Amino acid sequence: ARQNLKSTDRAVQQMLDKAKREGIQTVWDRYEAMKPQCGFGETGLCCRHCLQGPCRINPFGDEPKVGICGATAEVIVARGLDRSIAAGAAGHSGHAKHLAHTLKKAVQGKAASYMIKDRTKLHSIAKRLGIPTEGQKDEDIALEVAKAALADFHEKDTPVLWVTTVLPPSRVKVLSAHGLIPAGIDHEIAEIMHRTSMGCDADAQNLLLGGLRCSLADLAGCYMGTDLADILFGTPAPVVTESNLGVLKADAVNVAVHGHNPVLSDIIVSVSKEMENEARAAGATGINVVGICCTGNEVLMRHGIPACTHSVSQEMAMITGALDAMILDYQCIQPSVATIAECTGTTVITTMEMSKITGATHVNFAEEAAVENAKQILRLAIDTFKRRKGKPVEIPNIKTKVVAGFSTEAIINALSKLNANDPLKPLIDNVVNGNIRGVCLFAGCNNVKVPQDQNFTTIARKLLKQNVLVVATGCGAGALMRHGFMDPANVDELCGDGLKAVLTAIGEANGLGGPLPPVLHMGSCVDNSRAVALVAALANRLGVDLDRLPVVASAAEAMHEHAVAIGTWAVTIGLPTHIGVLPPITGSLPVTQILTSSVKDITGGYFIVELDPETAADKLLAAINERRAGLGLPW
Amino acid sequence: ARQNLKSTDRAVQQMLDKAKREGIQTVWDRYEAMKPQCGFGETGLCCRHCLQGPCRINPFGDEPKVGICGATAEVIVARGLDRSIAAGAAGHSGHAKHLAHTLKKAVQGKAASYMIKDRTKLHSIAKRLGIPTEGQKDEDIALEVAKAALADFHEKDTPVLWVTTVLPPSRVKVLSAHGLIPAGIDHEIAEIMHRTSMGCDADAQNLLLGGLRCSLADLAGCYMGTDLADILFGTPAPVVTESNLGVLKADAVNVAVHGHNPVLSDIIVSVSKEMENEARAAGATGINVVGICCTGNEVLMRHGIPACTHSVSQEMAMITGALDAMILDYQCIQPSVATIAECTGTTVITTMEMSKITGATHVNFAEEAAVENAKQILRLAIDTFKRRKGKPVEIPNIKTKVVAGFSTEAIINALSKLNANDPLKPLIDNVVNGNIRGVCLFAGCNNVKVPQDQNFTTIARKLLKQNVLVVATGCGAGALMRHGFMDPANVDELCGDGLKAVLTAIGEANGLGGPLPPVLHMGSCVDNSRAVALVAALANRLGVDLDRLPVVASAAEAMHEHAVAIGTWAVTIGLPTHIGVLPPITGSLPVTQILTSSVKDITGGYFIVELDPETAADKLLAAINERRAGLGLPW
Ligand code: SF4
Ligand code: SF4
Ligand code: SF4
Ligand code: SF4
Ligand code: FES
Ligand code: FES
């Protein structure tokens, strides 16, 4: 079996061989068993929005040509897409809502394990929202910030401030003119679900405008999540760590944190240090906390916790035999982990009331008891380590060096070493002179349909050679880190001369003796909001809207509904946005034409649907170079 | 072509013959073109919640057996069902939210076309919510009521009051013990969408408990909608009118109001009276406003507007050639009406920003301009009448007499003529002595899979002969009214002797010289909340919870997501609840077992899935008689 057709990650390939030997079914096996997949679903031409369904429409040929109620292909496709956007917004904003409640509990004396760790971030957010700080206690400022966060979920006398205060006024004006500013986060999610139900909205343009507005509700949830997590846990600054399965240690208690919301896993990190002695009494060397998915990104960015794996390959960490516990919150967790655990000996633990998995142990985490819960959890992990004393394990000896922690604050600070009072100017100077062709954000998941990481690395290599500044979040950052794109030792190999010169100048001015890494890791999926903050700051410094900047995005291997939401708000804020898997839109030419072309006339952004990564890189470079030409720059 | 296999309504059959002659495609034709429908979708064994899909599971046989991410059949089915519940809740609560904003605008002097029409209802709601009224202006009380309504959409220091203040304390306690009381209406909708996204909740029981809680958010939206519409437009009292296509008049301007929210169509009713002269200047006899679907129910209940048709047969009103305008809000409107209008000459007008139909004329209704908008709309209708002067029409000369307007206030008032200070006691006395075997609520839609009305009338006939008091809402009321079940002249034919005696006693005590009708029309789909108010009042008067009462529900021909939500909250509040179409659950035996059996141990209610209506009636009678036996009553 040619495992490189499943994943380009050599540690994953090794574990796929072990899973095959041992008869453990993987995500790739379940994908093979699903083929050929339903073409009605793949093209978007299926509707189950009422009990007269299921309805389907033949992409081509004879009947059925229309839904039972009269819903056309255009309507069916647009309604389906809208519900996916709403689902994504619901996830990011549920994460943000949880953090808002945590901050409120902390400053009300109800959860002493949590606190204001970043006072600077708290005050800047308060100022951005218009919350007075002068002569106020920090706990009172933070209570007002948490209350403002919660207020953005519902209608009120202002629109969603985590949209209108984070984008330039000119962009807010464009969006307002088209009716796209969200009135409340959960309000928009509910309105989507209403308008897409049977016998309601049935005009493709009207439906899709609703979708764009709900995608801005998702952006607000992302930005709110990043803001609150930085207040609570600290704004990231540059860190050095490692990635891939070789970060597991046979002689340690290996504990993975997995999911998206780090409200508990940040505590796990701190409590694990306190239980090192208890782990060694059990015969381990210590407790080795490692990350999976975006919760892993959160603790990597703030604490340098090494990242074990990501997304599609998450089961492989368990296949080593050395994963003693997998501590779950929610989002992007394959529920197969609970069954695989019976074969690998891993203790899979859920912690959130609305995210349980049959067969996994549940610990009822509460912020008020976080340290207590963390000790209960780590003691299960220690017990599990004890059960495998003397059992052989197979950890691939494969890992990469990762430099990360590039929050927007950290990037501005790094640039400030080149120009103290105008830190964005050195970046803009090098865009203008061509040393930096443009900026590309890689975001989103892996997807079993795409050999793991192949689109991210293929596209990134071409862009880096063409002097594009590449930033990354989520499992796009995961893909790039596991293939060495966050190791500064690879700048010479990967980067064009102009980009190398800039990365070197910034790195050497920050006391590194070497360049910044080839790709800047800006954090988790909610931390796509950090990229928005950087791009909005560049737009404001230049006096233009985002749809004039040479900035693009690529969800090169997208999977989750919240990647669909992110891609949609990237378009809505003005960016050319590549997606490297087929979204369920191709069954409607009119909807595809809106999303890939005529939306440019509304927001200035547009989707670029391209499954071939070499072709996608050329298309992204053309989009960047079109923006350069619109600014009168050489390219 | 045997049209009685499509609809049991003889006027619909006549129009199906006309549509066939004229080559106009109908809902039944589009259904035939869809067969055979996808069995994966029909059984619930399909998931499109991420871009790795579509995933399907064979009900029986070999692979695929599990989703790509590991999602089991139980998880896939429960997630799909939860999203349908959330969609239903989003519709009913969007309707309620609209009315709350309308009331607020009215009492703030911003929409003079609206007002407090039912001061008694306003004060009773205020008292139920704990809002002080003594020494307060009505406009201030109503502002506080509207603000409370809007607050129930989001988290706050109280749970959703339109749940906790409308059910008995003992029922609230049972629900609270299981974690089922909603925290906020839109909060629960968003949490469903989150928990059902990829890699989140993956335990069938946990998912379904979430669904039960979101169904209570739907109940709150229903009850809020009824409360606010009664304040604004008046609480229904008994009315006499007619139903079926024969209510159209060739010589008049025929204007249908269609959808669910009557915020504009109540205005249309009043403004149409003012434009009678203008209609006659155009050569019509007047303006003939008729109802379709639940907006039609709203104006039938409050004003006696005749109901033209319902649900699955809505296109047939247009096929007569006499429908000059169809005025749309949202929900349950087949979008085919916009295409059929090109053939029939009808002017189809949309009015709500989030519900447009390509090819229909849109009028941007605003409460602040409601009368202005209504005149613009009725002038389009008058112009359309003028275009058909001299054209032959085919209106089936088929109509029934309808007695309706049985709000819970009206029912209590009618009973009070038999016992002035204890009005529920005569009803309970006759349940105890067996003259009334129990109560059955018919609710929900028609569905093209079921010959139109056949389940409603078959089940109702059997129950009425067994002395069941039958109440009805929505298009269940529509089905029963169009077959004579709301005409008191049919009591002798349809009703058992004990039920006839009770209907006669109440009718004769209310100065009718005749009985109440065989079935009591309690209004629109949101007005299922009225049935909750009646049943909760009976429970309180008897000192028991709802799951001890001989009360059942039947969504005998269910279609829309909000019928799924209603059926689910009927179960959650404690009722045996029949559904007469297959919901997409049969692909999971564990989920089916929870919903039809083990949920009894949680809420005391349960679903009864039965597609054969004779069998369903026997099962409903067994459920009623089991409740009678639990109270120690003969049966
Ligand atoms: S909403 Fe229309 S297209 Fe969708 S399942 Fe129902 S009848 Fe079919
Ligand atoms: S990128 Fe996608 S797979 Fe990875 S965790 Fe942040 S949503 Fe999930
Ligand atoms: S969520 Fe799981 S079952 Fe659903 S489409 Fe994605 S991989 Fe398939
Ligand atoms: S019953 Fe069903 S079809 Fe009829 S209007 Fe009130 S939801 Fe729609
Ligand atoms: S017919 Fe396959 S996704 Fe519905
Ligand atoms: S395979 Fe037909 S509904 Fe998805």
Curated annotation (Swiss-Prot), chains A, B:
Binding site for [4Fe-4S] cluster 2: 47, 50, 55, 69
UniProt main location, coarse: cytoplasm
Residues holding [4Fe-4S] cluster 1: 38, 46
GO BP annotations, alphabetical order: generation of precursor metabolites and energy; response to hydrogen peroxide
InterPro entries, per database record: CO_DH_a-bundle, CODH, HCP/CODH, Prismane-like_a/b-sand, Prismane-like_sf
Enzyme Commission number, as recorded: 1.2.7.4
GO cellular component: cytoplasm; plasma membrane
Co-factor(s): [4Fe-4S] cluster; [Ni-4Fe-5S] cluster
GO molecular function, one term: peroxidase activity
Cofactor note: Binds 3 [4Fe-4S] clusters per homodimer.
Reaction equation(s) it catalyzes: CO + 2 oxidized [2Fe-2S]-[ferredoxin] + H2O = 2 reduced [2Fe-2S]-[ferredoxin] + CO2 + 2 H(+)
Membrane topology: Peripheral membrane protein
Keyword Metal-binding attributed: yes
Domain of life of the source: Bacteria
Pfam assignment, any one: Prismane
Signal peptide: none
Enzyme class: oxidoreductase
PANTHER family according to UniProt: CARBON MONOXIDE DEHYDROGENASE, HYDROXYLAMINE REDUCTASE
Its biological purpose: CODH oxidizes carbon monoxide coupled, via CooF, to the reduction of a hydrogen cation by a hydrogenase (possibly CooH).
Comment, domains: Cluster B is an all-cysteinyl-liganded 4Fe-4S cluster; cluster C is a mixed Ni-Fe-S cluster which is the active site of CO oxidation. Cluster D is also an all-cysteinyl-liganded 4Fe-4S cluster that bridges the two subunits of the CODH dimer.
Protein name as it appears in the record: Carbon monoxide dehydrogenase 2
Organism of derivation: Carboxydothermus hydrogenoformans (strain ATCC BAA-161 / DSM 6008 / Z-2901)
Gene: cooS2
